[PDB]
Amino acid sequence: FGNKYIQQTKPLTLERTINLYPLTNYTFGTKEPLYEKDSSVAARFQRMREEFDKIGMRRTVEGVLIVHEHRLPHVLLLQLGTTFFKLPGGELNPGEDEVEGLKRLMTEILGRQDWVIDDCIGNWWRPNFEPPQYPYIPAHITKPKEHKKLFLVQLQEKALFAVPKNYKLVAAPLFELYDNAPGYGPIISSLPQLLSRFNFIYN
């Protein structure tokens, strides 16, 4: 002995490096329109109620795809209305694996591809059949109506996306989302905070 051990790379929990690529490295093609399953707010919560009694808590997963321009991180979002933006993702089927399910949904929505999903970035819970969502399970709330899990999806150097005709694929800079719950909601507007721990490499 008397030898010294070469140090191991820092734990990924301590320092998580993510490679980002130029916005111009990505392109999109069109595909048939994808319509929302729920016509209105009323029908949305009505279906949420009906399904809760059959399969229980709704399990939603959403993917956060990051790119950059001028070394500034941008999150890819789907624009469906003047001020209506959403992350690619959706509802899991009963008993379906969270990551496998997100991969299925990513493909259904943006598939032209082997999605790399190795990071959980957050969780949000809906206690009642109402709009309110929280980043924790509220006190005495033993039966949340919905659980949304966010994952960071690592993109390859270049990629081609297929986007439903009624959707517009945009890249939103973090400064556009930060403290902008009125424009993007509580989840998307807190993405800057959720992504701050990452050590991004601007390729």
Please report whether residue 176 would count as binding a copy of itself according to CB under 8 A: no
CA distances from 139 to 22, 91, 97, 135, 136 (A): 43, 25, 27, 12, 9
- Identity of the residue, 74 or 161, whose beta carbon is nearer to a copy of itself in the bound complex: 74
CA distances from 127 to 62, 89, 137, 139 (A): 19, 20, 8, 10
The interface with a copy of itself within residues 90-149 (CB under 8 A) comprises: 99, 118-124, 134-136, 138-139
Q: How do strand 199-202 and strand 17-20 relate by DSSP bridges? A: parallel
Interface with a copy of itself by CB under 8 A: which range of 39-47, 50-58, 66-74, 102-110?
66-74
Please report whether residue 16 would count as binding a copy of itself according to CB under 8 A: yes
Could you say which of 15, 36, 50, 108 contacts a copy of itself (CB under 8 A)? 15
Q: Site residues (CB under 8 A) for a copy of itself?
A: 11-16, 70, 72-73, 99, 118-124, 134-136, 138-139, 150, 173-175, 178, 190, 192-197
